[PDB]
Amino acid sequence: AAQTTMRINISTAQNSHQGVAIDTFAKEVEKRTGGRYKVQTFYNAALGAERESVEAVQLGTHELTFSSSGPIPNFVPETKILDVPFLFRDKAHARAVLDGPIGQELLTRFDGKGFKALAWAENGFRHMSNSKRAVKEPGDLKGLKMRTMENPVHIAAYKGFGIVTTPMAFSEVFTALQQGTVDGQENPLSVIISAKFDQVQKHLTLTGHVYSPALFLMNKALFDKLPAADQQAFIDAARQGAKLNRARVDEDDAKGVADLRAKGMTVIDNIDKARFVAALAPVNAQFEKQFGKAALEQIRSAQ
Numbered sequence: 001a002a003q004t005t006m007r008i009n010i011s012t013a014q015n016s017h018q019g020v021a022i023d024t025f026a027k028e029v030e031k032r033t034g035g036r037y038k039v040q041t042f043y044n045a046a047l048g049a050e051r052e053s054v055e056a057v058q059l060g061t062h063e064l065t066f067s068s069s070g071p072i073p074n075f076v077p078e079t080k081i082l083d084v085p086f087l088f089r090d091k092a093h094a095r096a097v098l099d100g101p102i103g104q105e106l107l108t109r110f111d112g113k114g115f116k117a118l119a120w121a122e123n124g125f126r127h128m129s130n131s132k133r134a135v136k137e138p139g140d141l142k143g144l145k146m147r148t149m150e151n152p153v154h155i156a157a158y159k160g161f162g163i164v165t166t167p168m169a170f171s172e173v174f175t176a177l178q179q180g181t182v183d184g185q186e187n188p189l190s191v192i193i194s195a196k197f198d199q200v201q202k203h204l205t206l207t208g209h210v211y212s213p214a215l216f217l218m219n220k221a222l223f224d225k226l227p228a229a230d231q232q233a234f235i236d237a238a239r240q241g242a243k244l245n246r247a248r249v250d251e252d253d254a255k256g257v258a259d260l261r262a263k264g265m266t267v268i269d270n271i272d273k274a275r276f277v278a279a280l281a282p283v284n285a286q287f288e289k290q291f292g293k294a295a296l297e298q299i300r301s302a303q
């Protein structure tokens with residue numbers, strides 16, 4: 001029987017929340033299509049880091065990618081609202097928003113930019129790490145040189161803390177931290193652990209300053225050529241991928257502080273979040289003007 005082999009990649013390790021996502025997706029696609037579609041999985045930025053990969057999928061040089069929302073505004077501007085600091089109360093809030101009508105509407109914004117966005121998934125809440133000093137209050141961030149993703153909302157937000165930002169593809173981060181080009185970076189525990197950033201970062205604070213969604217993306221032309229039953233199979237495979245992805249994030253978050261302490265990191269997990277929110281007031285006010293009160297309240301009031 002005719003079979004098609006496609007490729008999907010991530011910037012992170014096979015042994016991570018995102019590796020679980022794409023391995024689960026590949027297994028489900030094969031099962032739900034009775035072997036007529038197979039998906040080869042690639043890790044650690046093989047086939048490109050996130051921005052390059054989203055571009056590649058748009059071009060069609062490979063078929064699929066799983067990416068955080070970080071580089072997405074370079075392609076689909078509507079997702080920026082999700083990247084606002086301190087927008088989501090907790091993972092349940094974020095997941096409910098993305099799975100429900102608000103997130104579905106955002107998926108439709110990908111169609112006109114040459115993707116099928118199969119499903120929302122999760123990277124996690126992001127936390128600040130660095131080599132220089134323990135961060136116990138927002139003032140401790142001032143002057144730190146921090147790598148960021150290629151995301152305009154994060155860059156503006158972190159400048160609000162007095163951080164000196166440098167956007168970089170994820171594939172360059174470990175080496176930049178090791179060499180001291182930047183003092184630090186920010187990422188969920190799922191990434192910090194799987195990327196072994198404990199080896200090149202002494203300090204971590206659970207600032208939880210933004211929620212980082214992720215997405216399964218497919219080249220639109222390729223998706224549209226799938227038979228209808230197979231389109232449905234790919235969507236359902238992605239949703240199952242998101243389920244196991246989120247479960248792994250939950251496990252990582254539950255055990256991660258003890259794990260990273262055992263590995264030698266000084267992890268500050270007791271901070272006054274209100275103080276960090278207050279520090280961003282000027283930039284918060286700009287985001288409120290940018291996205292509008294209705295859209296931000298629509299998300300904040302979701303339950």
Ligand SMILES: O=C(O)[C@H](O)[C@H](O)CO
Nearest residue numbers: 011050068123149170187
């Ligand atoms: O820091 C980043 O670039 C991302 O969190 C990473 O590629 C996983 O999605």
